[PDB]
């Protein structure tokens, strides 16, 4: 299948309570493999997956150095952003960054990403061409001008096409037992009466990986999109994910409803019914 590597930075200011906190996590697909927290007793990039632990001291020294440099740069960016938005130094604010690469089955670059936000809103983003920028407002346009003048996009492009893809390929090989294994959902339908003339049918999906899944209800073969209650996909805590979808049906019509499940770990889509 295709695969992705993503790094996520969060920098959060807290006036009166020290310097901004910087946290960074790294993922391959839906598997976290490293973390960094500036509030830790002794901040270091640290392993969160067994297949990364084999990297040597030069690796961990390198990544730790990067995260301290990044913490410093985004602390300064919080101070800069304050001025760009004419804001007081009393409040707490947040910068977020997500970046990385996607590769196809053959391991070549599908596309790269480098996107930033301020207080939960888009700030600036590297365009898919990896050579121009999209700025969300006149503040981000000031940053865009600086980055254009310094040819920043060229350096990100070189990273995204080169080191990002090369490292992702290495991780996929070292973690092939798990990163390259899809676990299909375990599925069942439950039935619970609401009243004498209505019942809830809930379609469960359990123990699947990766997180991407489609659960749909049909009535007489017609999708019940606007009438289905769909809960957010949630982590089980053991690498896998869980989801359910529910529909309220008239008593006696339960067999007119079917649940359809799509997942990477399934050769063909599943169709389930309530089995009384």
């Amino acid at each position: 299948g295709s695969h992705s590597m993503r790094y996520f930075y969060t920098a959060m200011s807290r006036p009166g309570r020290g310097e901004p906190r910087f946290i960074a996590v790294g993922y391959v697909d839906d598997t976290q493999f490293v973390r960094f927290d500036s509030d830790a007793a002794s901040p270091r990039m640290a392993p969160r997956a067994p297949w990364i632990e084999q990297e040597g001291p030069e690796y961990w020294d390198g990544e730790t150095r990067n995260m301290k440099a990044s913490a410093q740069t985004y602390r300064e960016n919080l101070r800069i952003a304050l001025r760009y938005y004419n804001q007081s130094e009393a409040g707490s604010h947040i910068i977020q960054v997500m970046y990385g690469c996607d590769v196809g089955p053959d391991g070549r670059l599908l596309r790269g990403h480098d996107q930033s936000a301020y207080d939960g809103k888009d700030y600036i983003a590297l365009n898919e061409d990896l050579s121009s920028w999209t700025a969300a407002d006149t503040a981000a346009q000031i940053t865009q001008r600086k980055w254009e003048a310094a040819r920043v996009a060229e350096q990100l492009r070189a990273y995204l096409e080169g080191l990002c893809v090369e490292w992702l390929r290495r991780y996929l090989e070292n973690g092939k037992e798990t990163l390259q294994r899809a676990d299909p959902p375990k599925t069942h339908v439950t039935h619970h009466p609401i009243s004498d003339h209505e019942a809830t049918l809930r379609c469960w999906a359990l123990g699947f990986y990766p997180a991407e899944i489609t659960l749909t209800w049909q009535r007489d073969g017609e999708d019940q999109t606007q009438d289905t209650e769909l809960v957010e996909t949630r982590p089980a805590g053991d690498r896998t994910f869980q989801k359910w979808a529910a529909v309220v049906v008239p008593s006696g019509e339960e067999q007119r409803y079917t649940c359809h499940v799509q997942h990477e770990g399934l050769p063909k889509p599943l169709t389930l019914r309530w089995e009384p």
Binding site: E63, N66, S70, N77, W147, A150, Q155, Y159
Partner: peptide, 12 residues
């Protein structure tokens, strides 16, 4: 490195 190294160029 695996993370992007030259982060100083990303001054706002």
């Amino acid at each position: 490195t695996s993370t992007f190294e030259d982060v100083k160029i990303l001054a706002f």
